[PDB]
Write a protein that binds this DNA or RNA. Structure first.
Lengths: 144, 163, 133
RNA sequence: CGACUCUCGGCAACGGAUAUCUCGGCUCUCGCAUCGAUGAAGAACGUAGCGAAAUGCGAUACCUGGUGUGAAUUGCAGAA
RNA sequence: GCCGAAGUGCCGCGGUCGGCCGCCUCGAAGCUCCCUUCCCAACGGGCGGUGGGCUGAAUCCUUUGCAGACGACUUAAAUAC
RNA sequence: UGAAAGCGUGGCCUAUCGAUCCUUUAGACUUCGGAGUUUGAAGCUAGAGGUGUCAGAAAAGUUACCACAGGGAUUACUGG
RNA sequence: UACUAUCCAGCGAAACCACAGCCAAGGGAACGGGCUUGGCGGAAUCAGCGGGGAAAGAAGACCCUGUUGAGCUUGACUCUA
RNA sequence: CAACUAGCCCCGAAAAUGGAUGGCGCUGAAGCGCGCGACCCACACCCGGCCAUCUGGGCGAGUGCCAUGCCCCGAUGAGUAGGAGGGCGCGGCGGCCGAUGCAAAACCCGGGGCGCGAGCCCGGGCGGAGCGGCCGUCGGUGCAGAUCUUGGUGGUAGUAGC
RNA sequence: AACUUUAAAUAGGUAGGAUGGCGCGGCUGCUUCGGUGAGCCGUGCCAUGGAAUCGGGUGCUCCAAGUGGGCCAUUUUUGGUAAGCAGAACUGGCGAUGCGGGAUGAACCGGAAGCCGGGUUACGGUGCCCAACUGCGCGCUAACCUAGAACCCACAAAGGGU
RNA sequence: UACAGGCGAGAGACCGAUAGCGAACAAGUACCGCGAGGGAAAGAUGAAAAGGACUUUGAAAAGAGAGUCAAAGAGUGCUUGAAAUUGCCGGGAGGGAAGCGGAUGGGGGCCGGCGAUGCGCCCCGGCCGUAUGCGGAACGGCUCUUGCUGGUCCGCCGCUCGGCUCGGGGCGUGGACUGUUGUCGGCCGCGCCGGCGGCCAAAGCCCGGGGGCUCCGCGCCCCCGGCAGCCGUCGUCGGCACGGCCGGUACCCGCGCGCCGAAAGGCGUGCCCCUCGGGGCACUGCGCUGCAACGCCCUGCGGGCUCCCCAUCCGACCCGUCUUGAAACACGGACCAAGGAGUCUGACAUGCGUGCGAGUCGACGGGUUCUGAAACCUGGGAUGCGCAAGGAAGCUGACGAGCGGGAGGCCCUCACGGGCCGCACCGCUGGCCGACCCUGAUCUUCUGUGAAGGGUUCGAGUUGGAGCACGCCUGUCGGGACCCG
């Protein structure tokens, strides 16, 4: 028996929260702020997945350093790295490579298990305090 | 008649060659297993038949990691029977060889496994050279793990006091 | 084997004939069986005399299913090409000329059918279409 | 035992369903810009040989000039 | 002659006539041709052949008022108290 | 506290109590987003101010002037 | 006593209809035309009739309920010309 | 002779539409209590045949092909609400094959036959221009109702009536 | 009932082993004034073997429909004079149940129902209806103020009879 | 960038006259209302009007003839012309009888069906010819340069023989739906007869003995020993006589294969028991599952199906709905035709399928075109591949895991089992990360740092990922949202 305003399930997903209960979230408001001004993206994207293709990754160009020991800016190898302040990379599963990732922030200590030459340098822009008093200098390489 | 007697009539029925088996290659392959199993002594090939019957939405992808880790000199390079597919999200250069047979391989896997050693064997060959089904492990593959046991929906499935 | 099974099907009959309840007094209500959905029907409750319901057990022997009473399997034959398939069977299958087929085309079906030796009902259908009682 | 009551068939009457038709609707898509006191949108009432209507038109009234096509218009009459 | 009933049938006589393994014969027991009751009684009807006989009723219109919602009831009129 | 071993997370035991919001109080922590400093504000964690229809809408009457959806789940009336 | 009804000639609807139509008692949605059991068992019908068909007309106006209205009142809630 | 025990029968035991061990009727019962045999008797039980479903087998080495096939098992099967499963019918579309003025579709048919059914098939009659089967695809897709909607037609009724 | 020393029955819980025991020897911040102990790890030993019986198999996970008004009988039981009453306790039914029986009856009795032939029963019957002994055996009953006649059930009592 | 109007176009898995717009047709018409406004019904003769002159009846309308037409069974009720209803007539039934309208059985009434007529053999008539040689070829196993073995067939000549088919002649066996009867086997019932033992066996009768009771005696009782005898009940075995039903046993059920005997049936030999009559017991392989009879198949008829009458039966009124319960003295429904209600979408969950897979998702777009398509392609963006906080943020999430039950495999063993490796999966105990709280080395832009050791806290984590896209069913939400109020 039905009249589809009983078993159909009432009309609206309230009374399951309203006086009945189960599921979802309960005890609601936490912090609030930020608005549409202070907004999107702090990225975390792992270094281990690029570290897989570090060895064959002379498509992000090596130069003075060896074929195996490869300069790669990881910023322009990671898609959608762009709108966020910094991407720092985690090391999950072992890496057995002599890769070199340049980052805007690093999970450094991360560098220590692939200490077999890695090049972990800071990003001038990571500081913030660099004098663009017209002048010239630091930024980060990029692509979409 | 009985309620006891009705109990026998209401029994199991897991049983199914899958509701729709679209893949003709899957369908002929299970026929090959069906023919050999009743003409051989092999418990193992009978297990394969069930795993290729009921669902494909249950067959688990298996990474190169953990495949390598249980053949660690305690299985001397046997044949790994992989129900679903090999996937390639690791680099160690794995074991220096291994004969891996599966239902399906990824295109990356076909290149990667054979250039580490052994040979990517098809399940057609597995049936051919081992209807006896010996010197063989059904290697592994999980879906029961951290993500997606009852961990579904939006916000999972909980520690457990209330849900 | 085949012969006593034929005898069982033809002589016994479950030609029960599944009539819908109250078909007799409401003309528009159809002769065709439809299952009484309501609890309140006597037919649903399985009272005898209220016309017994169709069930699988009423069903005939597997061999004698879709057979003509001659023990031939009936096939409606559209054209000359289909007669070649029937030729393989001979005794087992029958040829019966389709409704669509007109009188001239019936004749060519009959003469070919004679060669196969599957004369039964094929000839009979054609003869009426000519002019005959 | 006519009859009556009932039933069916065959032939019908009833009725306008069904099939098969469709110069129409319906919906989508495309192109186009272009009303008026210089008297509109809309109405009214007339005008065709024989017209009630629709359509067309306005006392220059089912139409005019000019132009194209190149012989019909037709229910009947008729002009030649 | 009886049984009045719901007698409608029963009983008696006498020939005639059929049937009678009642008794005796003939060819014969074969004529539904080597299991298929294969119809065989007669209460009744149908239908011919032939020997008689019965020589009409009823109903309509009309009418009466004895009678009536209309039929009907109840009277009358065709050659005569 | 008691010699200590011990015992003590209120009342010998069984009743005696309260969501999100919001405020209030504590934590000197975070954020106020172009950078600071300082007021002020907003957060997070644990308490208080409370809903007695007590798992927690924001609510007074009348209708014989009445209306409508339903009900014999149900009255007044018959019957049982 | 008139005019109907009735009967005629002409003319001619509607309401309403699951299927229909004889009772008694029994059990049963606890008051039957139908079932069960007994009694019965006029074709074909007309004029009448008001017991019955819990006849028909009307989603009971009453009465209860609905998180359904509206009219009204005010020391309701909340606003306002 | 008295007091008891407990059987049936009698009284106590009076209601309305006439009436109900259901009825007739029944008295060495057809009553009442009880015994003994025989017997009667549900879709139950058994045996056999058979259907589907479920279970277990089996048979493809190709080169007759349904191998989602075929064949052997045994047990089981009511069934509302409801679920899942496997089918049928209609309209149109892509494929494929057929049918036709020498008579299509449609419609009629106390005419035949098939399927458990959904339905299908075929004949005869009517008819006069296009249509159906099969494999995919898709729906404005199947009716008995809804105080149903719209059209037709009864009984009422040749009646109330005028 | 709101008393109980006492105190049943029917109900109810647990155990009857390899998801176990035992030997060996490791660690700890624990615990012991003490390696003392506790727990948990490696390694070895012991099978039908831990009452009975059964498992036409069982265990496990995901997801969704309907239901969300129940009603009845035996038994137990509270309120009420009672009720086909209102409300609990247990269970079976109806609901979701025909068929057979109770004349008849949604719930009682018998039994859960595929389709049939043949057999055989249940409940309940065997005078006739109405299939089937007017069968046998042994009693009782004579009813003019209601003869008697099948659980539930169609009512019935105190009390009286030389 | 927009476009439900207007104008002028192209199309659709659009609709097919109760549909589609209100309107296919004179439609915003006719009509309704005082008005605001409301608003239909209504397409089809035929190729061509060849739209029925003329004759006749009738007041006329019409009819009947005729003419016309491929067709008037097409006459402006017009193509087809369904259901309901109505008429005629026929059949069944009957005017002595009771109705759910059906089922079940039989008869009538009505009608379709029923091997082309089978087989062996021989004679005539008819036609053809193999083998082998010849001549031209599609084939095979294979090899696969290349090789060797095996082809068949047709053309149609040579050389030798022979066979088949239609019909007729001549002989033997006997086949055609369907109905009937005999039988073997299986299953089940049926009545009847017989044996032995149990229950120390004893009722029992004759013979013998004693006792009691009766104390009037007959008689009655009781007990004990010898005895034909026959008994109620329990158990078991044994034998007959018949029948129903199903099936004819289509692979191990059954059975034959040398001989006689109509027949059934019997006929070896050794062994052992009995040692009589007879018995039990041993000893080969193949092939294979229906027998007797009658009718007729056409003359003629069995039969099937519908109605009716008679027989029989649940007949809770017919269905649906509501309800605990519907026949209900609940509610709706005179009847019938045609409409007529879980749809479609966006975003979602599960399941199932498909692809690809640490990625995945072409189509905003651009290229291009056979043009609303299809094809091609871009960077991506979205989602995932790591998380956890309210937030700042996080040494920054890489050291890396055990145990028990575990399919299966491996090893040993003849097997039973034992041992080894152990997946799926499940349960459990840890470590690691974030949030939270402690711990805070060496160091250091002066408070940062985070080695190091922990915690009845907590997470949608890591501890050896699985997704994403597309689709379908079902569930879910917004939508008119199952339909209607």
């Amino acid at each position: 028996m039905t009249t589809r305003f009983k078993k159909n399930r009432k009309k609206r997903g309230h009374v399951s929260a309203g006086h009945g209960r189960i599921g979802k979230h309960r005890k609601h408001p936490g912090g609030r702020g930020n608005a549409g001004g202070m907004h999107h993206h702090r990225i975390l994207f792992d270094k281990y997945h690029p570290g897989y293709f570090g060895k064959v990754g002379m498509r992000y160009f090596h130069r003075l350093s060896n074929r195996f020991h490869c300069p790669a800016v990881n910023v322009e190898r990671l898609w959608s790295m762009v709108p966020a302040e910094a991407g720092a990379g985690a090391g999950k599963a072992p890496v057995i490579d002599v890769t070199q990732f340049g980052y805007t922030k690093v999970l450094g200590k991360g560098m220590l298990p692939p200490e077999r030459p890695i090049v972990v340098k800071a990003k001038l822009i990571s500081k913030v305090a660099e004098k663009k008093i017209k002048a010239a200098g630091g930024a980060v390489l990029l692509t979409a | 008649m009985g309620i006891d007697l009705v109990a026998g009539g209401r029994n199991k029925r897991t049983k199914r060659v899958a509701p729709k088996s679209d893949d003709v290659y899957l369908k002929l392959l299970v026929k090959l297993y069906r023919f050999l199993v009743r003409r051989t002594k092999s418990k193992f090939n009978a297990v394969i038949l069930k795993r290729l019957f009921m669902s494909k939405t249950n067959r688990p992808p298996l990474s190169m990691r953990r495949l390598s880790n249980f053949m660690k000199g305690k299985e001397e390079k046997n044949i790994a029977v992989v129900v679903g597919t090999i996937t390639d999200d690791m680099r160690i250069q794995e074991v220096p060889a291994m004969k891996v047979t599966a239902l399906r391989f990824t295109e990356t896997a076909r290149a990667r496994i054979i250039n580490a050693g052994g040979e990517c064997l098809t399940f057609d060959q597995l049936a051919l050279r081992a209807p006896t089904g010996e010197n063989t492990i059904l290697l592994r593959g999980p879906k029961n793990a951290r993500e997606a046991v009852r961990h579904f929906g939006k916000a999972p499935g909980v520690p457990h006091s209330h849900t | 084997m085949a012969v006593p099974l034929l005898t069982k099907k033809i002589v016994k009959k479950r030609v029960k004939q599944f009539k819908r309840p109250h078909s007799d007094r409401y003309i528009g209500l159809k002769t065709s069986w439809r299952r009484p959905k309501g609890i309140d029907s006597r037919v649903r409750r399985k009272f005898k005399g209220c016309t017994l319901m169709p069930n699988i057990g009423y069903g005939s022997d597997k061999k004698t299913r879709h057979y003509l009473p001659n023990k031939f399997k009936k096939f409606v034959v559209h054209n000359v090409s289909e007669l070649e398939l029937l030729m393989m069977h001979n005794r087992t299958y029958c040829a019966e000329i389709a409704h669509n087929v007109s009188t001239r085309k019936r004749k060519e079906i009959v003469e070919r059918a004679a060669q196969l030796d599957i004369v039964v009902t094929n000839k009979l259908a054609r003869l009426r279409s000519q002019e005959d009682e």
